[PDB]
Amino acid sequence: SNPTTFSVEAIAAYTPVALIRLLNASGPLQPGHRVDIADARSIYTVGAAASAARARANHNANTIRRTAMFAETDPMTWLRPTVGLRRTFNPRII
Amino acid sequence: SNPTTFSVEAIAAYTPVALIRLLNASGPLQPGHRVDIADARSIYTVGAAASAARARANHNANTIRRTAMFAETDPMTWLRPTVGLRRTFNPRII
Amino acid sequence: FFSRGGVPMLHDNVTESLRRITASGGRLNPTEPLPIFGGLRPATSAGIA
Amino acid sequence: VAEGTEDTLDVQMGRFMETWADMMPHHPHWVNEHLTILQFIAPSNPRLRFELNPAFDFFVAPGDVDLPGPQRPPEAMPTVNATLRIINGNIPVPLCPISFRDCRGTQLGLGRHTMTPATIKAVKDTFEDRAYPTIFYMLEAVIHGNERNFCALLRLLTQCIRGYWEQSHRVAFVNNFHMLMYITTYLGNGELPEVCINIYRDLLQHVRALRQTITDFTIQGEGHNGETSEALNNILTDDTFIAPILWDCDALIYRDEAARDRLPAIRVSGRNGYQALHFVDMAGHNFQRRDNVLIHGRPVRGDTGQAIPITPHHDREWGILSKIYYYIVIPAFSRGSCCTMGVRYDRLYPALQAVIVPEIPADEEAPTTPEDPRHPLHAHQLVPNSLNVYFHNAHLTVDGDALLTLQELMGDMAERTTAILVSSAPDAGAATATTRNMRIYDGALYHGLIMMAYQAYDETIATGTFFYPVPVNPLFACPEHLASLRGMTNARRVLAKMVPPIPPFLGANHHATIRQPVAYHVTHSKSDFNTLTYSLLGGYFK
Amino acid sequence: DRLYPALQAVIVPEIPADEEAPTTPEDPRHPLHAHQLVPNSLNVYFHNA
Amino acid sequence: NFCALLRLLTQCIRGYWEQSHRVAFVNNFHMLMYITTYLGNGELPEVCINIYRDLLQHVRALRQTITDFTIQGEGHNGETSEALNNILTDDTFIAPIL
Amino acid sequence: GRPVRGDTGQAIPITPHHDREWGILSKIYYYIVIPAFSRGSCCTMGVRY
């Protein structure tokens, strides 16, 4: 964040961004300057994907851990077969 | 349990296991060692059923006792006929 | 299948099998050994009704 | 017709697959029933010179070979053999058509019992269902047609059948014959809803109506050498002819007792003859058994013991109704799509040991809805590789004690499935001085199974984990279920698309009783679901 | 002689005064409840039906 | 991806069905296979899965109709009889969308 | 695409996801059922990821 050049959509596009539900691009985003850079769209896309999985962080003290889903060959598989959960339940744990 | 060589899934498979809801084989189960022994699957199968019938322990102070189910010749049988319960009721006693 | 001279198919087993199914369910057919240097006459039969 | 070699039926089927990959160099001549009368009659047909008698099938067989022989057929000069055509529908379809059989079936079932269209629709829906849950298959495999094992599980079975019915309006457990007997008997006083027991009772009434039609078209009082008139006219009333799937050893008892003059032979996985030792438990389960010992199951009104001899569980009418069901009602509804397979009990019983029923405290009410943490199918207790994930995949809700009845079921078990190949001379009506040399070989699977339809794109369970295809009938052949077999190629898949794969240690086509034309009749007829059954019954006359 | 001794055993419990008679079989005061479903009585004959 | 998004797709198909009585995700062939195989045990209502299974049954009936009107056991140069007679059973011809 | 039962890697070659029957059913669906219902109104197109 600091002093790592907060995003103002001229040159400050950077992958380690940390925001969620940002109302920045949607209206407080006065138009782009006279700066060429083209792959800032791909920088934001990886950045927003990283800033959404990091924005999860919690909700995993409530949602139970992910499981095998399919049926692969687990490291034993010689004293019990493998069957995966079809994720149709409601993970909340309360 | 002790000193009866707790199950580390190399050679320590033994019939008098006393566990229930064991999430040991399902994920904390680093792969099988360089030991020949093949009939540990049969040892585990008898052991798990012994570790599940013993894992009842309670639930017999709650449900009613098992009955004759069908109609056999019980030792009296000359002053009353015999009819067994069809186990479709809900045994809970509360 | 009594005539020779046209362009053949690339696979010989295709032509042989095609002649084999064509011969099934018919009266007059070329003889089974396919006599090279010959007129491809149909096999003669028994009496005529 | 080969012989058994005391293997575990997975190795033998694989060896048959490697043999059959290059055993056939060309298309066999007994499959081509797609010819009409004009194509069969035409002189280019190579089969026309081998159709002479109306009650004999002439084929080409290896010479100087007594028919039950080794796995590899010995090389010898070919000779022409013959085998008696017992069933009158075994005449080939160009000579006895489908339309004639359907019109004869319409003539047969004029005033007899017919099935209501609601039961027909529900049974047709559950026979063509590919998302049929495997939990029913495992429950039918473990219960294995024992009355005590069924009636120890009445709560769980009632909940399972109700949950499968009032979520998709399809009936359950119609696969096995020793399930609808027990449902119509025990779960028929009001445990199930009003519409389920109506479907089961309608199926049973149709089976008994077919039996009554068989009794009607015979004339009683003519018994020749220990054979009743029903067993001397029909085949579904013949005790020598057995069911494709055997659950109890009483069928072999009645077959060995009733025939008694036509020279019998039973080959159960190697050695000759069965043993039928009952009451197998955890201490002496012995999943890898190489003997010929079968599991008869516990007789309940008696003592099991050691020196106590075995007895039939049920009446002689049970075998007749089982044969009628398995040979009429199943191929009329599945229409040649069902396939018989065995089971892998050493991979199924450890998958049944894991129940995650929690510890409800004392003086507390049992939870019903699955939204509380105390329910066993709540997401907190859906630990992988248990039975709770197995029941949650099928979206069927169960209680704690219904899952805990598995331990009471677990007292009686089944070791493994084995192939029983029976053999006999023809009956006393057709036993002349030259037909006694001809024999009929038809195999059956002890503790087998049947699936209604095959799913290949369901990856929640790995393929071949529990069931492996061992098909024994022309009716029960399966070009699609062979993907469940381990190590399958597409060349074998297109090889089995034209020829029904029946292994030679379970009988051959030209030596069995049920042959190719009746399977062609059940798979290429579109008439009805009631006229097809009576047409199939009319085909099963000697 | 094998029916009237089978009709003797009725397991109707003792309900105290100023208490409502049970109708549903879920409460333990009902004759058809699983608590008073003792074998070889008329209650198991009615429960099998 | 479908087996990970099972819950969201169940809610989406249910919300689209019991407000306008129209079947959803019918455009893709790799959607109704996954609906019938996975979402076919009661997650969807009783009428939706009947529609998907009836469409799949009709597709397999068309396949069996193709299989019936050929003669098996006659194949030239690594081509089965179905591919030599028909095009929907010919592996050289490809789907419009891959 | 990511394989269902296996490890991706880089030296591991590509394996088909489904059976050969899936291709047949996809061809049958896309060339029969889609043009029978839409009747020439549906259009195949790409996407902008």
Side-chain angles (χ1 to χ4, degrees), chain D residues 272-341:
Chain D
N272 318 329
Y274 63 96
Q275 298 267 39
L277 164 152
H278 46 276
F279 202 88
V280 48
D281 40 353
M282 289 315 259
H285 54 283
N286 208 327
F287 274 130
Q288 293 93 16
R289 185 181 295 274
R290 226 173 260 282
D291 213 38
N292 47 6
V293 163
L294 309 182
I295 301 309
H296 184 56
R298 294 162 58 139
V300 61
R301 196 167 294 114
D303 200 38
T304 62
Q306 169 60 81
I308 312 204
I310 87 180
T311 204
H313 270 56
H314 295 148
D315 307 22
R316 196 175 306 246
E317 192 100 349
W318 196 296
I320 313 299
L321 296 189
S322 63
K323 269 137 64 81
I324 278 175
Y325 189 84
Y326 276 122
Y327 283 115
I328 292 191
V329 180
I330 297 276
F333 275 115
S334 57
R335 302 224 168 176
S337 57
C338 56
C339 178
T340 75
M341 328 159 172

Side-chain angles (χ1 to χ4, degrees), chain D residues 108-139 141:
Chain D
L108 252 56
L110 208 44
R112 264 76 141 182
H113 169 270
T114 178
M115 299 174 87
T116 49
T119 77
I120 279 179
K121 198 253 281 182
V123 165
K124 183 195 67 175
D125 268 319
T126 189
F127 260 91
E128 298 175 356
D129 199 301
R130 318 262 162 168
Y132 186 80
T134 48
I135 314 302
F136 301 101
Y137 291 128
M138 319 205 308
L139 253 56

Side-chain angles (χ1 to χ4, degrees), chain F residues 70-82:
Chain F
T70 74
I71 286 175
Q72 319 266 7
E74 174 189 357
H76 295 101
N77 275 302
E79 291 250 33
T80 181
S81 308
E82 314 310 286

Side-chain angles (χ1 to χ4, degrees), chain F residues 27-52 54-81:
Chain F
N27 83 77
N28 221 34
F29 184 60
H30 310 77
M31 275 310 188
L32 81 152
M33 271 305 178
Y34 297 144
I35 280 158
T36 49
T37 38
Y38 299 114
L39 291 193
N41 290 115
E43 285 96 305
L44 287 188
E46 205 263 320
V47 199
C48 315
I49 50 173
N50 282 2
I51 292 179
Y52 289 112
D54 174 65
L55 262 168
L56 200 53
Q57 269 176 65
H58 195 259
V59 166
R60 284 164 178 161
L62 295 157
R63 166 69 173 111
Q64 293 303 322
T65 282
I66 282 178
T67 292
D68 173 355
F69 266 88
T70 74
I71 286 175
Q72 319 266 7
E74 174 189 357
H76 295 101
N77 275 302
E79 291 250 33
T80 181
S81 308

